Amino acid sequence: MASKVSRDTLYEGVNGLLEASAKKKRGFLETVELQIGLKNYDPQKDKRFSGTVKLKHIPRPKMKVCILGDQQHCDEAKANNVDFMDAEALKKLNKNKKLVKKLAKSYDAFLASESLIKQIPRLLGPGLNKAGKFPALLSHQESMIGKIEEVKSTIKFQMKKVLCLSVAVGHVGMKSDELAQNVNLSINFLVSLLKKNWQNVRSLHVKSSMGPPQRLY
Amino acid sequence: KVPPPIHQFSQTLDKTTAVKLFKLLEKYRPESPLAKKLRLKKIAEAKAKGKDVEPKKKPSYVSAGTNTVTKLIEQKKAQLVVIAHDVDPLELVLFLPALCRKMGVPYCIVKGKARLGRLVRRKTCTTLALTTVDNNDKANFGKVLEAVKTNFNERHEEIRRHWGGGILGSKSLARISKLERAKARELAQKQG
Amino acid sequence: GAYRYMQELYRKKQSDVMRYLLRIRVWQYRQLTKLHRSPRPTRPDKARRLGYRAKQGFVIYRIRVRRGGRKRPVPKGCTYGKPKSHGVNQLKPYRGLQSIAEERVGRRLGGLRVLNSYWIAQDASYKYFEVILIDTHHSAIRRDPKINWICKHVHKHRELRGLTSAGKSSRGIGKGYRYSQTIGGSRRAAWKRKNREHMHRKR
Amino acid sequence: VGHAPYEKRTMELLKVSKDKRALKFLKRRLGTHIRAKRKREELSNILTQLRKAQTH
RNA sequence: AUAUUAGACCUCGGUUUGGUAUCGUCAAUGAAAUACCACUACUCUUAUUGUUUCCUUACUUACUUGAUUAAAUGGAACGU
RNA sequence: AAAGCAUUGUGAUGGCCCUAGCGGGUGUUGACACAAUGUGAUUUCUGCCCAGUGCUCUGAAUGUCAAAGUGAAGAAAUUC
RNA sequence: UUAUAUACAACCUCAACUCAUAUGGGACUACCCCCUGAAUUUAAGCAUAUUAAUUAGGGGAGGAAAAGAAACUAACAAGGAUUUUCUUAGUAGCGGCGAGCGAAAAGAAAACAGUUCAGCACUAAGUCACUUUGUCUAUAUGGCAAAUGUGAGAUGCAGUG
């Protein structure tokens, strides 16, 4: 029912997870998942709280983000690994695409910028209201504090219809102490970031792809 | 139906290993009537002649009572704790065998509260401890200890769970033991 | 010590260990007399802390009392009066079943003082109690100065006068405000005072 | 010793259905809002604590 | 990407390097573009312990009742 | 009052009655009895009426409909 | 031991005695404690109310009794066990909001007195009652010691607290 290369019937101590330098047989490193489940809290209506697991750490995430800008993004960011697209290559993304044999929706999350409220509500109808890759200025990144670190392990949640989300909590390219470092930061930040919440949650089951899901107390 | 704190007693330390228990506990009887204050007339020579601390020569014997032995286990000064099965009402002993496990002291339950009382020279003793381990006789104390531990300490996971009592008895079991004769034999003689 | 575990163990009266202990101790004590000597105190953790010691002669006696209100003993040719007077079958005593319990022991044992009483079991028609009673002319109750107060003469039949802990509660004795009108003592000491009509000399 | 009935009758009403009914049933068995709240927070503390040590 | 494999490494499998492999992660074109990968849901099936105007049968140990100077009750056994 | 006549209840964990409570009377009883009533020996007869009222019926089940229990709303009191 | 066939023991629950020693009932009525509890009356009738948490009935003590050293007040600049008097006050309240009823804190006096248990790492049952033997000096339910004789006591006696 559950393999015990990560123990789960024997419940977890912090002293046992640092054996996992000898966990991985594999050289290539792919994603282990943020898997949040919002039951008792329906997100399809205006019921929505906007936070991010702000990691101070880099567990090496494996991906890419294309961003925007109209006199608003990269007056500071040319030492910050940036492109400064003029923000209307977004119908380059809506029913036009980047190329054949790779999609324009092939990214993480998109950029609600300051000049492009001209474009949001229904002009993104068959582009991004259709897709589901569009956050708002709630994104915790408009090239303000964490631009590459948005792509590199700080990204928020825009939720599944059946409440089964899968984005990066971290990876398998961690060290032997990093397994107790990502959730060690949310011991103060997401305890009340859940809005109007005594404790309406218990499911904290961090999934790995190169192993069983790490289930928490 | 008896709820499984009752019975622990009566899984009371069957005879061949509780006979060597009192073979050992005959050496730690507390007092003798004349010999307590025959030792306190060997203090009379310390009044004028001895002039030192000669006659105490540190004691070692059992500790009786139930309020005493509760604070031999809550400090872990106790090395072997004897309890009694036939205590009334029960409550002055009911906490005890669970606390010898929670504090990790090898306890045993013996048959007799009069059995222990006659070794502390009184009527009924209810429970005992053993703070001493005195070095010349730790051998036969040794294989008493684990032999006590198998049916009392390591068993404290079904002792917490399994007890019924619940006997049906005795002409009522004998009534249906004719019914399980006949209801079986009706489809055991079904072929003719 | 053991005496502090017994205090919490006995608070678990709706448990399963301590339901099928005062199961087997309500159908032993009701296959015997209404009023009965006891060789021990059956709850020796509550006996002491009421006053009992293991000295001769402290003596324990069990009772039982009959668990209900007070049917008013009017002759079935029932109460003649105004309609506030007509209640028969739903009235309650002013003394409790424990009050009336050690009352029934102090009469039948006039040669002994009642110290304190204590619940040991009940089921549906009989609550019953132990009662710590003391042989006051014994040569160990009198020679020993801690208990020795009740060997006096203001302690003859204290339980028939409201002076044990059980008979005391019926009276309504406390401080301050809520317990006001028995404020001179009794309750009737207070009606005597509150109705006392002082004509003065100089008035 | 274990629990009384009304603790076990509301531990099973605490795993699933209506924590508001674990505080109407506890305010009938106790029955004040201050003692019901103190017992619903200590049954639901050994519900979660035995959710630890039932496995290991 | 893995699987696999021989060699550098390891006592060896194994790791690693590269080859090979299933839709694909991507195209087409939309209301989700779905590799490599999980926290699971409603019609049901299991298997362990659950309100009730629940329901029937059965038990004995509370309790009720009768009888007796509380004498032969319940089981077996041989002998027919 | 009576004898005669009739009706009623009761097969006992019952009917009737006493009792504050325990408990008792009938009862050393058992339907040819006990208890409750009307009529009043014999003779001859005892018509019609179950609308009102009383008594009565496993029985009519949903018009009414107690507390307890159960469900919901509310921060709870509590109201539905 | 216990095929209920030899004992033996020890406890535990209960007996019995013209056993040793003791203890208790009954009286009084003014005051005192615990209970039970009316109706006349008034309300211009009368049922709640009133009379009255009283007459009568029942039980228990003492020279006093009960109470009594905070699960009390207050809302202060704070007070500090009980009981009695003065005042609060015929007040707040309660009431067919009718008849009627009706306290307390504070303040001022009288008097003043404070404590003990159960339950803890008291840390050698360190306790008690008998009985006998020495032996004190009331006509002693005394005083001390001896035997520590027999028992109470580890289901908890003393000391500390």
UniProtKB/Swiss-Prot annotation, chain A:
Single GO cellular component term: cytosolic large ribosomal subunit
Any single GO BP term: negative regulation of TORC1 signaling
Residue runs in coiled coils: none
Keywords assigned by UniProt, alphabetized: Ribonucleoprotein, Ribosomal protein
One annotated GO molecular function: structural constituent of ribosome
Gene3D superfamilies noted in UniProt: 3.30.190.20, 3.40.50.790
Pfam families with a match to the protein in the record: Ribosomal_L1
UniProt keyword Ubl conjugation, yes or no: no
Keyword Ribosomal protein on entry: yes
Domain of life: Eukaryota
Family matches, as PROSITE patterns: RIBOSOMAL_L1
Family: Belongs to the universal ribosomal protein uL1 family.
Name of protein: Large ribosomal subunit protein uL1
Source organism: Drosophila melanogaster
Gene of this entry: RpL10Ab
From Swiss-Prot, chain B:
Superkingdom as given in the UniProt entry: Eukaryota
Keyword annotations from UniProtKB, A to Z: Ribonucleoprotein, Ribosomal protein
GO biological process per UniProt: cytoplasmic translation; maturation of LSU-rRNA
Entry GO terms, CC: cytosolic large ribosomal subunit; cytosolic ribosome
GO MF terms held by the record: RNA binding; structural constituent of ribosome
Keyword Ribosomal protein: yes
Family classification: Belongs to the eukaryotic ribosomal protein eL8 family.
Protein name stated in the entry: Large ribosomal subunit protein eL8
Residues of the full protein shown: 80 to 271 of 271
UniProtKB/Swiss-Prot annotation, chain C:
PANTHER family: LARGE RIBOSOMAL SUBUNIT PROTEIN EL15 (PTHR11847:SF4), RIBOSOMAL PROTEIN L15 (PTHR11847)
Region annotation Disordered: where it falls in the sequence: 184-203
Family: Belongs to the eukaryotic ribosomal protein eL15 family.
A GO term for molecular function: structural constituent of ribosome
Protein name, entry field: Large ribosomal subunit protein eL15
Amino acid composition bias (Basic residues), ranges on this chain: 189-203
PROSITE patterns: RIBOSOMAL_L15E
InterPro entries xref list: Rbsml_eL15_core_dom_sf, Ribosomal_eL15, Ribosomal_eL15_CS, Ribosomal_uL23/eL15/eS24_sf
Keywords: Ribonucleoprotein, Ribosomal protein
An annotated GO cellular component: cytosolic ribosome
Biological process, per Gene Ontology: cytoplasmic translation
UniProt-listed Pfam families: Ribosomal_L15e
Swiss-Prot record, chain D:
Domain of life: Eukaryota
Localization (cell): Cytoplasm, Cytosol; Cytoplasm
Record function comment: Component of the large ribosomal subunit.
Family: Belongs to the eukaryotic ribosomal protein eL36 family.
Subunit structure and binding partners: Component of the large ribosomal subunit.
Protein name as annotated: Large ribosomal subunit protein eL36
Annotated source species: Drosophila melanogaster (Fruit fly)
Lineage: Eukaryota, Metazoa, Ecdysozoa, Arthropoda, Hexapoda
